[PDB]
Amino acid sequence: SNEDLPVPMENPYKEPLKKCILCEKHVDYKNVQLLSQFISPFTGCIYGRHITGLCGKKQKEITKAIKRAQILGFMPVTYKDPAYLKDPKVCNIKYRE
């Protein structure tokens, strides 16, 4: 008879889960600019999750997309393409101190 007892309902304050940078977006091996932002400009290495910040699905796709462009002849391997050196920075690594 007591209406003050709590009801068995889900949490109404569940904030939506965080979206990665490339969530709901289609990666490709033809757009060099998108792939080049995740490559160290001085060396040409590929950043990991702790630097890129992407989720578990788009990190593998970027890795496969980049390597496809390495062999098919669309982007340099040992360095970042200088034409896309002024693109906005998305990684969290800083070299200059």
């Binding site: 889960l17 965080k18 979206k19 969530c23 709901e24 490709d28 989720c55 699905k57 098919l72 002849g73």
Partner: protein, 122 residues
């Protein structure tokens, strides 16, 4: 589209470039392929020097061809382009639009795992 042809051609003038595409598209049709469209990516400096047919190439034009073809004729198309000398590096991949972008919900946070050791006094 079903197949995509990552075609890179040696840099040359307008007439022979059109001729090279004309016979390349003819070769695809002879193997039983219905080409959808031709996309031009312009001429760009190659990322690195590529050796093909006893030549060192630094500049070339990029072209993209998408078509529907039987699975058994992919080897014939690749072999034919290998003997052609006006193409520097041909490659065939499945068209990316064939696969659908899988729906995503978010980055699910993984809680730290417990109960990995006994509760005895260390």
């Amino acid at each position: 589209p079903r197949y995509e042809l990552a075609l890179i051609l040696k840099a040359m003038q307008r007439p022979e470039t059109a001729a090279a595409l004309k016979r390349t598209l003819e070769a695809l049709m002879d193997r039983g392929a219905v080409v959808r469209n031709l996309e031009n990516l312009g001429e760009r400096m190659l990322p690195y020097k590529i050796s093909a047919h006893n030549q060192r190439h630094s500049r070339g034009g990029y072209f993209l061809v998408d078509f529907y073809a039987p699975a058994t004729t992919v080897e014939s198309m690749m072999e034919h382009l290998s003997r052609d000398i006006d193409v520097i590096r041909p490659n065939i991949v499945k068209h990316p639009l064939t696969q659908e972008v899988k729906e995503c919900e978010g980055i699910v946070p993984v809680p730290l795992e417990e109960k990995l050791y006994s509760t005895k006094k260390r």
